[PDB]
Structures are given as structure tokens and as C-alpha cells.
Amino acid sequence: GMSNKFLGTWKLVSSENFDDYMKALGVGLATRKLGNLAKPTVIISKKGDIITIRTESTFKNTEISFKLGQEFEETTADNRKTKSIVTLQRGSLNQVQRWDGKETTIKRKLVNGKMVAECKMKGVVCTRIYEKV
């Protein structure tokens, strides 16, 4: 189901509109500044049917592990506690995070060998491109 082409180590090379996304999330200024400077490495691995996404940066490291279609609790890098679910749709790995009464999505898709993460919260859309390394 999940392309084994997602598996590996990915390095952020381009980020667009991420400041606005973080602002939408209520991330404060000092954290936004560091957040915008970060160029995370994302490591995607699979163990059976459990996918792990590890995000590594000087500022913050996060790690989520899940099975597709199974709701899980996540503590995000900005310390939201969300109820999250990851599914595949059309080859894209779609992550929905819900908390209080909000929702944000992170879609990860492979585009010509690169991984493109689109982060969306209502009208705010970020695009983050990663290179496989």
C-alpha cells in the first residue's frame, strides 16, 4: 500500500509558508523563529505494519509510530496533544491531527523522487520539500 519509496532519510530543502502555518497553530514568535530556521531530517521507517516517522532537528525531535487507519495520540513538536490518524490516499500519506475543536492535515507525497509535505490548516497551506539522502 505505502510505497516503500517513502522509507528512508529525508532532508528538508525547501519550506514555504511555514511561518503562517505555525502562526495559525498559535505557535509563539520565538518558537516560530527557530521553527523557520530548522531544516529537519525526517526518517520514515516501517516494522511490519507499524510506520515510524522521526523528525530530527537541533531545535526539536519528534517521533510518531502508527498503523495506517488507527487513531493514535500524538504530542506534536509545539506540544499539542492531538488525536491523529494517518491513512493513504492516492499514494499520499495523509496525517490528520485533531485537538479541541481544530484540525490540521499534513499530506506527504512523492513527487519526482522528492517528498513533499503540505501542511494545511483552513486557508493556510505550507509546502515543504525534502530530498532523500
Ligand X SMILES: CCCCCCCCCCCCCCCC(=O)O
130 annotated among ligand-binding-site residues: yes
Helix/strand/coil percentages in the chain, nearest 5 = 10, 55, 30
Torsion of CA 82, 88, 90, 94, to 10 degrees: 20
Contact 76, 103 (CB under 8 A): no
Q: Does 60 bind ligand X (CB under 6 A)?
A: yes
129 annotated among ligand-binding-site residues: yes
Binding mask 17-56 for ligand X (x = CB under 6 A): -----x--x-x---x---x--x-x-x------------x-
Site for ligand X in 70-99 (CB under 6 A): 76-78
21 annotated among ligand-binding-site residues: no
SS3 category, 113 = coil
Q: Which residue's CB is nearer to ligand X, number 60 or number 102?
A: 60
Cβ contacts of 123 within 8 Å, gap of 6 or more: none
Give the residues lining the site for ligand X (CB under 6 A).
22, 25, 27, 31, 35, 38, 40, 42, 55, 57, 59-60, 76-78, 106, 117, 119, 128
